[PDB]
Amino acid sequence: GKSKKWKEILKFPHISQCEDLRRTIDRDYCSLCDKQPIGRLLFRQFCETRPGLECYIQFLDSVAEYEVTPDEKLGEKGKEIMTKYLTPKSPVFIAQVGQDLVSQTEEKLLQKPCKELFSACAQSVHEYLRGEPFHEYLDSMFFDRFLQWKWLERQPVTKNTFRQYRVLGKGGFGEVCACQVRATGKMYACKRLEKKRIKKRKGESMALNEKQILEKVNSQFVVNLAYAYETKDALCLVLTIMNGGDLKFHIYNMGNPGFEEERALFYAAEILCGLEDLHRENTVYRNLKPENILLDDYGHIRISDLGLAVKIPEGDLIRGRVGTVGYMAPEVLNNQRYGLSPDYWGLGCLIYEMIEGQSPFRGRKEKVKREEVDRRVLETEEVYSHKFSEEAKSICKMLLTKDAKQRLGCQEEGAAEVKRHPFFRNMNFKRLEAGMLDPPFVPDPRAVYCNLDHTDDDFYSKFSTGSVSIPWQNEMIETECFKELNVFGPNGTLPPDLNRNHP
């Protein structure tokens, strides 16, 4: 449902409009050719024009396919890749990897196949593209086209940029609206935080914290910020839409209560990956409970409520005591200084609750006051049942270790220590992260599973940063606005918008 005149809205500016862009965008290879979606495509498309470069983009594609290849078909896929790219007389031959590394790769295949066999060649290839190919791309019309896309990304976003639909629930201050970007037709979930209620509470720092944690996290398993704009009355956060309901509803209304272990395995795997992405930004979630794990239209989950998240400075501890009764780690209950450990405690509570259909310290059919629940979180060992394999018991109690120093995932190794746990022994994370493992439950599309003071002006300016680069570029790709608009001249000639001669 794109706006009637969307090709006018996303109409490319003339390349002469982007000179300021050209002089300020940092020419970092990883940013312009990989991390940024549209930059990645444009650079790949530049390599589509040089015969020598084309072979390298095809190779990196086959390596990615190899990484998520099932363990049994690794030898087959490896032998294929070997005889297709790294053999000398091939029409598609990787020459910059050097015969000194292609002979090594032939030995890796002579022994057990590993999912990392081509990692050495892949870096060698990127080491080559960082040089002459990248700097050629910079002086090509595809980087001028990239600057045109950046120019659109920077355009101001406003209330008129969106199309509000229905009320998607309510929370602190305001409610989740349902945005649709007029120009592209993509759906989102507004988060209208009312201005009069932020100032009345004096909670301005809490709004920017959430907005800034959201724009930095770039996870498949955490709600991502796409836009941040102000609309006179309220500040808005445009977020990933999740129409599949929350995990609490699926544990208790759709569950036994509870899930089969293998089903909870899948959700735990995706939640662990969410926490891992947050921890890369040394950010602690602290709100891990079933109602905050949402499902999407496909059945995948994302962590949603980041209102209690904070960015921990590197080499620092914080003091808080926040969250929900029953889902506060003991170090949080005691108001101690902690790091990321509360989230691995929450993961434990989630895995337990998914398998057993009740909390490990409160019975589903138990009327108990908070004093006893908290006392239990601090003093009693949770007990398991025949719904848990020995592996499931192990990870839950390791994650539910009262002492954060001895708790799983709270060492220097981080989330990797949790992924190694025998509970994920049958879980292939590369494939999960690549979205290749089918979710265990697919929501049906049709279903519904549920003043003038300038001191405020400086706060609105730091919030209303507008578009978020990576989410925005991905939006252009999903809606096919990129495929449709990213057209050049007939026979690789410069289109009018990229020729500095006739504007």
Ligand X SMILES: Cc1[nH]c(/C=C2\C(=O)Nc3ccc(C(=O)N[C@H](C)c4ccc(F)cc4)cc32)c(C)c1NC(=O)[C@H]1CN(C(=O)OC(C)(C)C)CCN1
Q: Taking each helix axis from N to C terminus, what angle separates 99-110 and 119-129, rounded to the nearest 10 degrees?
A: 160
**CB-nearest residue to ligand X:** 171
Site string (297-336) toward ligand X, x via CB under 6 A: -------xx-x-----------------------------
Query: Can residue 18 be called a binding residue for ligand X (CB under 6 A)?
Result: no
Q: Does residue 171 bind ligand X (CB under 6 A)?
A: yes
Q: How far is the CB of 287 from ligand X (least distance, A)?
A: 8
Of 237 and 398, CB closest to ligand X: 237
At 317 the three-state DSSP class reads coil
Burial 295-328 (b: 16+ CB within 10 A, else e): bbeeebbbbbbbbbbbbbeeeeeeebeebeebbb
446 interacts with ligand X by CB under 6 A: no
Name the minimum Å distance from CB 98 to ligand X: 48
DSSP run (H or E) holding 311: strand 310-311
| Site size with ligand X, rule: CB under 6 A | 26
189 binds ligand X (CB under 6 A): yes
To ligand X, the closest distance from the beta carbon of 302 in angstroms equals 7
* CB of 25 or CB of 178, closer to ligand X: 178
Which stretch, 68-76, 185-193, 365-373, 381-389, contacts ligand X (CB under 6 A)? 185-193
Site for ligand X in 190-219 (CB under 6 A): 191-193
Q: Does 450 bind ligand X (CB under 6 A)?
A: yes
Q: In this structure, which amino acid lies at residue 421?
A: H
Query: Contact between 339 and ligand X (CB under 6 A)?
Result: no
Smallest separation (angstroms) from ligand X to the CB of 347: 19
Q: Tell me the C-alpha distance between 343 and 288, whole Å.
A: 7
Residue 366 CB, nearest approach to ligand X (Å): 27
Query: Per CB under 6 A, which of residues 223..262 are in contact with ligand X?
Result: 223, 239-243
Do the beta carbons of residue 473 and residue 38 sit within 8 Å? yes
Nearer to ligand X, 70 or 169 (CB): 169
Binding of ligand X by 169 (CB under 6 A): yes
Complex with ligand X: residue 39 or 307, whichever CB lies closer: 307
* Residue 445: cis peptide before it, omega within 30 degrees of 0: no
Per-position DSSP letters for 96-126, written without gaps between them = TT-HHHHHHHHHHHHS---TTTTHHHHHHHH
| Alpha helix segments (H runs only) across 94-246 | 99-110, 119-129, 132-138, 141-154, 195-201, 204-216
Q: Which is nearer to ligand X, 277 or 331 (CB)?
A: 277
Identify whether the C-beta of residue 295 lies closer than 8 Å to the C-beta of residue 244.
Answer: yes
Question: Between 74 and 308, whose beta carbon lies closer to ligand X?
Answer: 308
Decide if residue 172 touches ligand X (CB under 6 A). yes
Which residues of the shown chain bind ligand X in the complex (CB under 6 A)? 166, 168-176, 189, 191-193, 223, 239-243, 294, 304-305, 307, 448, 450
